[PDB]
């Protein structure tokens, strides 16, 4: 979706933003 | 200029941008996750907007350069993973709806909270409140409770978004030339237009298919012992041919079983083997902890953490002054800035979990190697697996004994063993029929097998006959019940843990080989072999510049996923588990019900 992941754990979708 | 000269133009320049506006993102969202603030999030959120307003420019700007008309490789390879992070296809209206939808499902899930009964008052958020009843309690009518609270509360506030999302993901994923979403998520596999290691959508579903069918009498042995065991600890409760109530599995959906240890244990009469003892006794601190996972890498022959890492990384809880999210988390935000997040206790379990971790880390250092658009795992899979291999080595007796967290002289017998097996297959044998049904039910919803009318029929069907888990209360169509799980109401895929789960044990096995391991494949540990680390290194740097089944192919071997390490490393285990059913019902009625 991003491009690439800047971590390895799935954060929930509402910081996502 | 040719239009091969004009794309390097293009990448060159996209290159120099997405660098500076990945690590201003990266970055924020470290910040927000280590001490949470309104600037942190604003910052976030205006970093990650840019990021994302960018990302889909510049995807619509790189289709003015046809891949074919592309000699060079590593700028197609660059050009095609730009074309594949574009998001302008679905109808504006219909985007705004679907994000919203995102971040109604996401909050509703991390709000959560449930009441009880005998309580007004006693409301119970779902971490760490739920989850602990899910985990601890021995009482059928408490984790009933918590189960149908969970399940009927939050579920039910989902069902309606849950189906307005399913259109949406499919109209995306059809107007991009896809079959349905879940196609789309299988796309994460998908290898096309190179001789020798293609694989196809299709071809995922035939070797999940075909692999579960090889590890079901595995599950079907280890059932059978976990039901004969959960009906002296239920003795109402608990038909000798049934499913296993879903309430009664060790956590708030029975996606692990490892909780159902203490119930469960082959010989309970053996003393804890758990080193949390010694690491206090000899006074670890979160330090020792990071430091001791280094060492391990540097045995292999890989780095050394960076200055950056040390000076950078949060490896304690940082109290109340500053206030941070406590999940382990590993980061690679660019620009050769590598971080651990981790509230660090001295348990042998967050010492496992630092080598997970540090392996992520590994990872993302290794791949740095790679142009910007290929710092990512060969597929969702790998990370996991690099992941998982770590703690493998590490919780062996042997690695224990060598950093000084067991006795020179610790005795293992078949009885440690098959506790040491026992508990890894609650973990990791337990999830896979699990993760197979939740992901085949999803690929079924947005295919079109399943009618709305039918989802909750057709889930609990699929957990009676696949997960051979029944549910204690009938569900109507007015829940969502694989909502209630982080990764449905999140928007994740979920067979990345069944892929992941084969990948480790393939990954060990040959690692193991190169190591020159003597006995047992669940004993090895890849310590200080550095021919081990050059094999894996080797994939590492590889990022998704290759095919993921080349990737695989030079580590192990094959170019396909393969049961047959898994197996071998449980074999043990389930001749025991064999023997101990030899008078036990092996198998499960599809009817019988808890409410029957
Ligand atoms: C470009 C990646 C991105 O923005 N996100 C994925 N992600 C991570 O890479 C960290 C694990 C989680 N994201 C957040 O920062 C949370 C909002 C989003």
């Known amino acids: ?17 | 200029s040719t239009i091969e000269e004009q794309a390097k133009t293009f990448l060159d320049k996209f290159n120099h941008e997405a660098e500076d506006l990945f690590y201003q993102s990266s970055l924020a969202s470290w910040n927000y996750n280590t001490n949470i603030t309104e600037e942190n999030v604003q910052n976030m959120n205006n970093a990650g907007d840019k990021w994302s307003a960018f990302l889909k420019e510049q995807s619509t700007l790189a289709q003015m350069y046809p891949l074919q008309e592309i000699q060079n490789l590593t700028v197609k390879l660059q050009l095609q993973a730009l074309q594949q992070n574009g998001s302008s296809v679905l109808s504006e209206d219909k985007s705004k709806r679907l994000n919203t939808i995102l971040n109604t499902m996401s909050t509703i899930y991390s709000t959560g909270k449930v009441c009880n009964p005998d309580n007004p008052q006693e409301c119970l958020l779902l971490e760490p409140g739920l989850n602990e009843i899910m985990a601890n309690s021995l009482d059928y009518n408490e984790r009933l409770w918590a189960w149908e609270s969970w399940r009927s509360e939050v579920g039910k506030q989902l069902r309606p978004l849950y189906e307005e999302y399913v259109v949406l993901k499919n109209e995306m994923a059809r107007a991009n030339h896809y079959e349905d979403y879940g196609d789309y998520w299988r796309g994460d596999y998908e290898v096309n237009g190179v001789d020798g290691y293609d694989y196809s959508r299709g071809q995922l579903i035939e070797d999940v298919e075909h692999t579960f069918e090889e590890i079901k009498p595995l599950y079907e042995h280890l059932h059978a012992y976990v039901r004969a065991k959960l009906m002296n600890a239920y003795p109402s409760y608990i038909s000798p041919i049934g499913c296993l109530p879903a309430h009664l599995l060790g956590d708030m959906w029975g996606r692990f079983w490892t909780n159902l240890y203490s119930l469960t244990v082959p010989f309970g009469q053996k003393p804890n083997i758990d080193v949390t003892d010694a690491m206090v006794d000899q006074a670890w601190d979160a330090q020792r902890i990071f430091k001791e996972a280094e060492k391990f890498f540097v045995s292999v022959g890989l780095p050394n953490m960076t200055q950056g890492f040390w000076e950078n990384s949060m490896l304690t809880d940082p109290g109340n002054v500053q206030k941070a999210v406590c999940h382990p988390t590993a980061w690679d935000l660019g620009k050769g800035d590598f971080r651990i997040l981790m509230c660090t206790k001295v348990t042998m379990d967050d010492f496992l979990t630092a080598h997970h971790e540090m392996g992520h880390i590994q990872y993302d250092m290794a791949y740095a190697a790679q142009p910007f658009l290929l710092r990512n795992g060969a597929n969702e899979g790998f990370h996991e697996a690099v992941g998982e291999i770590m703690s493998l080595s590490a919780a062996t007796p042997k690695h224990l004994k060598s950093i000084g967290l067991l006795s020179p002289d610790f005795q293992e017998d078949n009885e440690t063993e098959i506790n040491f097996l026992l508990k890894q297959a609650l973990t990791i044998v337990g999830t896979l029929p699990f993760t197979y049904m939740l992901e085949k039910w999803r690929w079924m919803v947005f295919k079109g097998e399943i009618p709305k009318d039918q989802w909750m029929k057709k889930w609990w069907e699929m957990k009676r006959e696949i997960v051979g888990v029944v549910e204690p209360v009938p569900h109507d169509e007015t829940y969502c019940d694989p909502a209630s799980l982080f990764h449905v109401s999140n928007d994740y895929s979920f067979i990345r843990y069944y892929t992941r789960t084969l990948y480790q044990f393939q990954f060990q096995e040959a690692l193991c080989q190169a190591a020159k391991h003597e006995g047992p494949l669940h004993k090895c540990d890849i310590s200080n072999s550095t021919e081990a680390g050059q094999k894996l290194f080797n994939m590492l740097r590889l990022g998704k510049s290759e095919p993921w089944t080349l990737a695989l192919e030079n580590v192990v071997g094959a170019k396909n996923m393969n049961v047959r390490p898994l197996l071998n490393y449980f074999e043990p285990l389930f001749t025991w588990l064999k023997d101990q059913n030899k008078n036990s019902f092996v198998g499960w009625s599809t009817d019988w019900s808890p409410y029957a």
């Open chain 1, 1 to 17: 979706a991003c491009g690439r992941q800047f971590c390895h754990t799935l954060m929930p979708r509402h910081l996502c933003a």
